[model samples]
Target: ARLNITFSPQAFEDYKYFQQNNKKMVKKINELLKSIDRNGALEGIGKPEKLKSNLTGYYSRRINHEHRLVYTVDDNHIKIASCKYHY
Candidate 1:
């Protein structure tokens, strides 16, 4: 089976946000997701990054120049914490 997707409510909204406006970004998002699914252990071109501080247990990878995807265990296959721009 594929990575048990547990994308956030925000994931849907954000995707729709892209689907609604950012045509090119939507494809990259879907492609990034597939690559993420491939790694089961996790992979990237978006070059993977481990978050620290309060984000100590999570990970980040680029989906685009303006946005990055974040992941965590959240007790699942992959917890989509956020898909936002940098700090």
Candidate 2:
């Protein structure tokens, strides 16, 4: 079954910022989103790792050496939480 994917308001804003600032990654981001919807949580994509601190239940997929896509998976949906940068 395909999982429904939704982004938080802040996350949507973050994605817009990412798109504007990192034009090269836009295609990669789309590919990743489609991959997540088609295959569920992917471990190979970014060494999918569980988060810590207040984000304990969330998972992060590495977008690159400096960026990551943080999200949470529900039984029927996947919520994109943020596009975080290491800096």
Candidate 3:
């Protein structure tokens, strides 16, 4: 079965930044989300790395050189937690 995808408020806030800064990336993000929904964290979608510290249960996928999509997956759902930008 396909997994469901949901986003936290912080994740939506972060996505707003992405949408404002890189309009094209919104489509890429949606594609990634759909891929995850269909295949569940497979290798076809960028490498997913387990996070540490406070984000121990979450995984991070490189959206680009500067941005990452952070999320956690469970049996039937994927909860997008945040989008982070690196310096």
Candidate 4:
């Protein structure tokens, strides 16, 4: 299983908010994201309707209470768009 993930500038900005405001939450989010990015949970979760429009051909799935991972499959790899936070 090989995948290439590119984080947008906004993603970095979002991460900074977590890193600066809530270290614990950021840690938890990254832990779950690693699981999905490495383990292919995004493929398992199936495509989501809401995010599908925002991100064509991509699918989104939950990692935890506050975060969701959005990604798409391309060729032999999965490209991650961003990890969106709720609340």
Candidate 5:
């Protein structure tokens, strides 16, 4: 089953930023999302790492040297938490 994807306020805001001028980043984000949604794994995607702090259990993926895609997976859902900088 495809994982349902949603975004936090910050992520949605960054998504808007991506849609504006950072279109390439937008594609990368979509690719990341689709990969997890379709395959349910972060393997072979951007350098994935388990994030620390309050975001325990969350995963981080490289979007660029300056930006990262931080999210969490729960059952059949994925929540995009941060899209600009690590969380």
Candidate 6:
């Protein structure tokens, strides 16, 4: 099975803005996401846990400091729903 990953439309727009405004940070963040794209799983960050209450049987793992990676896990796939940087 193949994992399907996608960024939120709003997040895509925000990333574009960041691309133009905050090149350095955006580049770093994109690199991190690219790693995740190549690898099916991202572990050892934040309070990685199962979101049982989500009704969709999705799981989420995020950056410990200031970022969130929302995702869904299927039989043999992990779909990245969105990535949001916190305030």
**Which candidate wins on lDDT?**
5
State the lDDT of candidate 5 residue by residue for 57-87, as single tens digits. Answer: 8988888788888887888688888888734
Cα error, candidate 4, residue 81 (Å)? 3.1
Question: What's the TM-score of every candidate structure?
Answer: 0.75, 0.75, 0.74, 0.56, 0.83, 0.51
lDDT of each residue in 1-87, candidate 4, tens digit only: 232456667766776787889887667656655555665544333233335454667666665555666655555464556666645
Model 6's lDDT to the true fold? 0.55
lDDT of model 2, residue 63: 77
Error of 2 at 27 (Å): 1.7
lDDT of 1 by residue, 58-80 (tens): 78888877688887655436677
Give the TM-score comparing model 4 with the true structure, all chains together: 0.56
- Candidate 5 TM-score to native: 0.83
Candidate 6 lDDT by residue in tens digits, 1-87: 232446568666666777788776565555555454555444443445567665355555553356555665455444556555646
Model 3 misplaced regions, further than 4 Å: 1-4
For each candidate in the order shown, give its overall lDDT on alpha carbons: 0.71, 0.74, 0.73, 0.58, 0.81, 0.55
Clashing pairs in 6: none
**Ten-residue region with minimum lDDT total, candidate 5:** 35-44
Sort by lDDT, top down from the best: 5, 2, 3, 1, 4, 6
Ranking by TM-score: 5, 2, 1, 3, 4, 6
Identify the leading candidate in terms of TM-score.
5
Model 2 stretches astray by more than 4 angstroms: 1-4
lDDT of 3 by residue, 10-83 (tens): 77877787788977777667776766676676444857788889989887777777677787778857789876
Assess candidate 2 and give its TM-score to the true structure: 0.75
> Lowest summed-lDDT stretch of 10 residues in model 4?
41-50
Candidate 2 per-residue lDDT over residues 7-51, each given as its tens digit: 988888877887889777766666667666666765546668888
**CA RMSD for every model?**
2.9, 3.0, 3.1, 4.5, 2.8, 4.7
In terms of lDDT, the poorest run of 10 residues in model 1 is 36-45
